[PDB]
Design a protein around this ligand. Structure first.
Ligand SMILES: [Mg+2]
Ligand SMILES: [Mg+2]
Ligand SMILES: [Mg+2]
Ligand SMILES: [Mg+2]
Ligand SMILES: [Mg+2]
Ligand SMILES: [Mg+2]
Ligand SMILES: [Mg+2]
Ligand SMILES: [Mg+2]
Ligand SMILES: [Mg+2]
Ligand SMILES: [Mg+2]
Ligand SMILES: [Mg+2]
Ligand SMILES: [Mg+2]
Ligand SMILES: [Mg+2]
Ligand SMILES: [Mg+2]
Ligand SMILES: [Mg+2]
Ligand SMILES: [Mg+2]
Ligand SMILES: [Mg+2]
Ligand SMILES: [Mg+2]
Ligand SMILES: [Mg+2]
Ligand SMILES: [Mg+2]
Ligand SMILES: [Mg+2]
Ligand SMILES: [Mg+2]
Ligand SMILES: [Mg+2]
Ligand SMILES: [Mg+2]
Ligand SMILES: [Mg+2]
Ligand SMILES: [Mg+2]
Ligand SMILES: [Mg+2]
Ligand SMILES: [Mg+2]
Ligand SMILES: [Mg+2]
Ligand SMILES: [Mg+2]
Ligand SMILES: [Mg+2]
Ligand SMILES: [Mg+2]
Ligand SMILES: [Mg+2]
Ligand SMILES: [Mg+2]
Lengths: 55, 145, 143, 63, 67, 60, 141, 80, 206, 70
RNA sequence: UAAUUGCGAUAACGAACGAGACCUUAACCUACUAAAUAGUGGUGCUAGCAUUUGCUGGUUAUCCACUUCUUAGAGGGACUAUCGGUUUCAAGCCGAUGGAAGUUUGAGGCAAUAACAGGUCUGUGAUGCCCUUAGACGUUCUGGGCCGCACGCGCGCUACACUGACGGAGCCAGCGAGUCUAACCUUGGCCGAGAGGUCUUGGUAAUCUUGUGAAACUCCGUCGUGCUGGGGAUAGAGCAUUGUAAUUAUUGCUCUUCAACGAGGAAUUCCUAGUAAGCGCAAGUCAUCAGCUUGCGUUGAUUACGUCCCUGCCCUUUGUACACACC
């Protein structure tokens, strides 16, 4: 509880300030996938009969 | 106003409330380099003391300075409202103080300590060197400590 | 020739009337004057210190002469300006209704304005009288 | 110091990659009957008066 | 850029074609003409038409014009 | 003129385009001195969809 | 009823109406003399018509003007326009044409629009900027 | 009760009625028709009801997983 | 001048200069001439004006800018640096003051002095960044008169403002200082310096 | 701090014997004559006009302006 | 040409979608029809100042007349008109005069064909399929959380002052909006340093709030270049408002504390006239909370009126073994 929280060193600002900052902080967007956007993953395909029945 | 004169009369620099105060500033503001005397306080105190604010810290009789202090540290007696005061309703004796000079540091210490000693979140928050008035802390103040 | 105040520029008039109400000695100055601000939208109190209540008195009066009726609200709105909300944008803010209301009550007791029907405060006929008079006086210094 | 005054008589067009320069034929004033082509820096119309700082020398293209 | 659309130029053509006597290098009257003599739905478009047919007349007066 | 000013998108993506609809409200009054008969006649008829007709009376 | 015309003047949204009747020569604005006015720097702007056309001229006439709308500079241009327009409107019904046209001449000549209203007006802001042309700000990524 | 009243009223030719013709496609397809038969029919009937022009779009998916659309216009329309 | 009056009356000097000569705040427009051929046509002076304020439509066409009265061009160019954008009443007054000041020093129609510092500051020739291939040399150009006036005003007021920043001397005083130092060109003015240097490099690269 | 906030009698006389040749006097000029800051220099402006030297030719806040007496 | 907008060239001729037209809003009508829910002049009732007429107000009706200003119906108006330069003397472009207006009159609304695996299943009782369905992924209730802080990035607000801050005083907008089976917009009177409180009040509104007396701005003072009286972060104490609830502080006020910031590297955004920039306001959200948006008016410039150098995009010509089309 609150006694805990004030008494706990390894807490508060000074302690953080003195730690190194990770590199994933200064990362970048990620992106993951995009030049696959037009490439269908479904592996299924339709078929000229089903399409011709539909449309 | 008027082309003035005087002689050796005015001495530059003068020391009140355990601090120092420059001459050659418009007195009202001189009083400000003391802790706990914002421009308003100074203004009203000087008006109450019966002083010519047109004067520098420069001139001013010794007497005058004395009165100025007396009122500065006994506001409630020399009819200053009490909503004008930095420490109304103590929290123990409940009187109203206008804590001044080297003592306002103490009073800050005191209050912060009371919060810490009682384990109150505000206290913990202080102890941690963080912002206490609820502001977001992701983005602001990173130059910091 | 004949005269009004409308024949006299704002400042030298209102200062003429300031100096007058001042001189006079009849007035009413609440007492909280000097220890007070004029609007929450302000930093420091007035610099006229002893006086300025006469300045606002004059101003208020002339404002009421120049129209039908006006209340405390309209004056607060008038006498108010921009308050720096420090680091967050400026916003207009009304001035204090005490200062004004008390001023009205003062000029009224001095019979220079009167509770109007319709609402508010209408200039008094003896207000007309005395204002047209010092107006005249102010053009007379200028002769 | 020798100033030389010339009157714009024809506006030729814009040079410079950016295209803010303007080629002009000017008839200098203290003795006409002689024309030179200069390059401006400001906006220019027919009949303005340029102070050729140096009197004989002239350009053409500009990249 | 003030260039007249087809419908306008087309209409000037046809009008001058079939009503050249009446019409007269004055917009003001060619206008009124257009009112009495053809059916348009906006003042604006009618004016545009008249003014151009007025131009066209005004230059026919000094030699023919193709079309 | 009643303006309503909304984003076109139902979501959030896209440059932030704004759109603004209006309903135009036209109001009129005609004052008439008459007897009961003509008012009742004239106002039961002249009826019209879309036009809100209101007949009052009095001088207060 | 004496001879009398009404006119007006218009800059931005301000509008200034003039009542120009037969009088002993007043020239008042809202309810004060045309000598007060202040803006002040701009004061001559409102004197301007009188001096362009000779101070006399206003001796057979009383002039009054009332401006509402616009703001401080806005109102100055409107009132002056209204006054000059006024004077000319009056010479057109009461004095003779040649006089009026001599006045239009000396105004129109020097000018500052005195007789003709400036058409400049607000353009509407459009979503995507704090102004009409001003677009907001982009970072790309 | 009685301060509100309903009347029906046949419509002068459903043929120039967007809403009617939409509902009609809805029904044609729902009643298990063809796609082009349904649409071309609605269109030919709208045209036949003396319209200046007409257009029917079918968007979404029929029978094949992937979505498609189709414009079916005849006659003359203006758009702006 | 024959005085005249009616109901609400018109002040003395007012009547006086008003109906007579058509002069400034109260300075002569007659006399006052442009000591450099050219520049005339691009420095106004006549038609004469009362104060440098005008609902001027001087933008909607390429050159009509020229026709705007010079003094008002100067005051216009005063009212910038963000905080001051707009604020012509400010500017105008600053000019009235400036002209009073300039007048105090050495007489002259101060509007004539202004005219002189304007004449005396426009670069007779300059330079542009021609390509010529990646490493861009600098082709000397002779600059327009219009550009010369423009840039003269720009320079004068800038230097005057930059000077005036962060010291007790007030805008009108330092504007008058720049104006004066420039009117009879004295290399103690920011303007004259900048002109002289532009032409130094412009020579240096022909 | 860097000085000119009082009057030092020598300063007063200095003001009286230095203010001709000042074709221009203002708040700024008085400061520039290595003395009086814009407080008491304003007073100097009011009090040379007590009678003499300075001839008032312009008006207001910020800008004042005077010339040598005649 | 803004335009597959036109001229012209011409195996093409003459057309339609789209552009244009159209519509809306801002500009001009001493011409039309009118108005106590807009206003002007006369008159009465009347105040003040001069007095010689005069000058400045009061008086939702004491009456008479009007429609310049305001309102909104109907019209009219402009067609780049006239003139002149320039051009294949073509469409056009330019300058001058006139003009409310001559940059598509300014600004928007509408907007073809085609494309994208753009975003949205978290707007929908729009929806396929999958999942889940009583120890629920249905729902509701209590409490916490989306605000958590070594730090990287974006939009912003406020500043570094003297074209300024402070203090008197002057004092002017436009677009909005507001309470029925309810508590919304609020004038006026008092009380209060303030925030606010309290008693009444007008308005379902061109009628009342409200001339929304907005802010920048103008003027007379104080300060005087000093992190200064520029700046107002952080923090302490007290008082009030919304709300069942304010702790992690909704917001408002007073006193006090008085940070960085002395014009910002590499870079990079936006913009051509009532525009840019400065400045406030109303509306959305809303019990309470705007440093956001959407509109609005106020003050109101400098600089181009050009080009293809950078960038981006369209177009020809050209190559293709691509056509699910260089993912
Ligand atoms: Mg202090
Ligand atoms: Mg104020
Ligand atoms: Mg205000
Ligand atoms: Mg705007
Ligand atoms: Mg079409
Ligand atoms: Mg296009
Ligand atoms: Mg009489
Ligand atoms: Mg009489
Ligand atoms: Mg009308
Ligand atoms: Mg013209
Ligand atoms: Mg339009
Ligand atoms: Mg995708
Ligand atoms: Mg959806
Ligand atoms: Mg689902
Ligand atoms: Mg939703
Ligand atoms: Mg739906
Ligand atoms: Mg679930
Ligand atoms: Mg969040
Ligand atoms: Mg980011
Ligand atoms: Mg954004
Ligand atoms: Mg101020
Ligand atoms: Mg109290
Ligand atoms: Mg009620
Ligand atoms: Mg209004
Ligand atoms: Mg510092
Ligand atoms: Mg401050
Ligand atoms: Mg909390
Ligand atoms: Mg939290
Ligand atoms: Mg400080
Ligand atoms: Mg900077
Ligand atoms: Mg909240
Ligand atoms: Mg809000
Ligand atoms: Mg938001
Ligand atoms: Mg090959």
């Amino acid at each position: 509880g609150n006694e805990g929280a004030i008494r706990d060193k390894t807490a508060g600002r000074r302690n953080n300030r003195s730690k190194d900052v990770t590199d994933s902080a200064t990362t970048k967007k990620s992106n993951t996938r995009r030049a696959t956007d037009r490439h269908s993953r479904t592996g299924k395909t339709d078929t000229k009969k089903k399409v011709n029945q539909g449309w | 106003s008027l082309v003035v004169q005087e002689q050796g009369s005015f001495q530059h620099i003068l020391r009140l409330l355990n601090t120092n105060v420059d001459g050659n500033i418009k007195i009202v503001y001189a009083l400000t380099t003391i802790k706990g005397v914002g421009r308003r306080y100074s203004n009203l105190v000087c008006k109450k003391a019966d002083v010519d604010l047109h004067k520098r810290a420069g001139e001013l009789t010794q007497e005058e300075l004395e009165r100025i202090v007396q009122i500065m540290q006994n506001p409630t007696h020399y009819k200053i409202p009490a909503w004008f005061l930095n420490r109304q309703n103590d929290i123990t004796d409940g009187k109203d103080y206008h804590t001044l000079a080297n003592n306002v540091e103490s009073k800050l210490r005191d209050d912060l300590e009371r919060l810490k000693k009682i384990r109150a979140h505000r206290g913990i928050r202080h102890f941690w060197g963080l912002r206490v008035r609820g502001q977001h802390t992701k983005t602001t103040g990173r130059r910091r400590a | 020739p004949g005269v009004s105040v409308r024949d006299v520029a704002a400042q030298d008039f209102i200062n003429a009337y300031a100096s007058f109400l001042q001189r006079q000695g009849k007035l009413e100055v609440p007492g909280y004057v000097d220890i007070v601000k004029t609007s929450s939208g302000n930093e420091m109190p007035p610099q006229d210190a002893e006086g300025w209540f006469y300045k606002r008195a004059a101003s208020v009066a002339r404002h009421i002469y120049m129209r039908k009726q006006v209340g405390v609200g309209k004056l607060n709105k008038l006498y108010g300006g921009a308050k720096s909300r420090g680091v967050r944008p400026y916003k207009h803010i009304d001035a204090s209704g005490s200062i004004n209301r008390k001023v009205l009550q003062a000029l009224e007791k001095i019979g220079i304005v009167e509770i109007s029907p319709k609402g508010g405060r209408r200039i008094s006929e003896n207000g007309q009288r005395d204002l047209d008079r010092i107006a005249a006086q102010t053009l007379e210094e200028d002769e | 110091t020798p100033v030389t005054l010339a009157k714009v008589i024809k506006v030729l067009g814009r040079t410079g990659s950016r295209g803010g320069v303007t080629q002009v034929r000017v008839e200098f004033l203290e003795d006409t009957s002689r024309t030179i082509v200069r390059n401006v820096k400001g906006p220019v119309r027919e009949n303005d008066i340029l102070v050729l700082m140096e009197s004989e020398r002239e350009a053409r293209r500009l990249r | 850029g003030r260039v007249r659309t087809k419908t306008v130029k087309r209409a000037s053509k046809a009008l001058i074609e079939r009503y050249y006597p009446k019409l007269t290098l004055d917009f003001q009257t060619n206008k009124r003409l257009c009112d009495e003599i053809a059916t348009i739905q906006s003042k604006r478009l009618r004016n545009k038409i008249a003014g151009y047919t007025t131009h066209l007349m005004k230059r026919i007066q000094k030699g023919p014009v193709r079309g | 003129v009643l303006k309503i000013s909304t984003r076109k998108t139902p979501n959030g993506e896209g440059s932030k385009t704004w759109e603004t609809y209006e309903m135009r409200i036209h109001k009129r009054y005609i004052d008439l001195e008459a007897p009961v008969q003509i008012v009742k006649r004239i106002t039961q008829i002249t009826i019209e969809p879309g036009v809100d007709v209101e007949v009052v009376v009095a001088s207060n | 009823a004496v001879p009398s015309v009404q006119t007006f003047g218009k800059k931005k949204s301000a509008t200034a109406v003039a009542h120009v009747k037969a009088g002993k020569g007043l020239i008042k604005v809202n309810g004060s003399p045309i000598t007060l006015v202040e803006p002040e720097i701009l004061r001559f702007k409102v004197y301007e018509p009188l001096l362009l056309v000779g101070l006399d001229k206003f001796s057979n006439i009383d002039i009054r003007v009332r401006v509402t709308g616009g703001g401080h500079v806005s109102q100055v241009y409107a009132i002056r326009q209204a006054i000059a327009k006024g004077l000319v409107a009056y010479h057109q019904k009461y004095v003779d044409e040649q006089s009026k046209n001599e006045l239009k001449k000396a105004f129109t000549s020097y000018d500052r629009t005195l007789l003709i209203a400036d058409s400049r007006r607000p353009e509407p802001k459009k979503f995507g900027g704090k102004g009409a042309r001003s677009r907001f700000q982009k970072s790309y990524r | 009760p009685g301060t509100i009243v309903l009347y029906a009223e046949r419509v002068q030719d459903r043929g120039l009625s967007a809403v009617a013709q939409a509902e009609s496609m809805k029904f044609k397809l729902l009643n298990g028709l063809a796609i082009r038969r349904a649409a071309y029919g609605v269109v030919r009937y709208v045209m036949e009801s003396g319209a200046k022009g007409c257009e029917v779009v079918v968007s979404g998916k029929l029978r094949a997983a992937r979505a498609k659309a189709m414009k079916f216009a005849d006659g003359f329309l203006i758009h702006s | 001048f024959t005085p005249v009056v009616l109901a609400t009356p018109i002040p003395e000097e007012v009547q006086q200069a008003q109906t007579e000569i058509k002069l400034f705040n109260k300075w002569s427009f007659e006399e006052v001439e442009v000591k450099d051929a050219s520049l005339v046509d691009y420095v106004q002076v006549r038609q004469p004006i009362f104060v440098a304020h005008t609902a001027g439509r001087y933008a909607n066409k390429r050159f009509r800018k020229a026709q705007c009265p010079i003094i008002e061009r100067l005051t216009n160019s005063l009212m910038m640096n963000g905080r001051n954008n707009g604020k012509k009443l400010k500017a105008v007054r600053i000019i009235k003051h400036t002209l009073d000041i300039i007048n105090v020093l050495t007489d002259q129609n101060p509007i004539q002095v202004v005219v002189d510092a304007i004449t005396n500051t426009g670069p007779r020739e300059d330079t542009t960044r021609v390509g010529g291939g990646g490493a861009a040399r600098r082709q000397a150009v002779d600059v327009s008169p219009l550009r010369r006036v423009n840039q003269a005003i720009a320079l004068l007021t800038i230097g005057a403002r930059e000077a005036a920043f962060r010291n007790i001397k007030t805008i009108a005083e330092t504007l008058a200082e720049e104006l004066i130092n420039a009117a009879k060109g004295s290399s103690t003015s920011y303007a004259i310096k900048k002109k002289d240097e532009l032409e130094r490099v412009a020579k240096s690269n022909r | 701090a860097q000085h000119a906030v009082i009057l030092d009698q020598e300063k007063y006389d200095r003001i009286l014997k230095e203010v001709p040749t000042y074709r221009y006097v203002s708040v700024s000029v008085l400061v520039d004559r290595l003395k009086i800051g814009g407080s008491l220099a304003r007073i100097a402006l009011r009090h040379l006009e007590k009678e003499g030297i300075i001839k008032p030719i312009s008006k207001h806040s910020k800008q004042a302006i005077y010339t040598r007496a005649t």
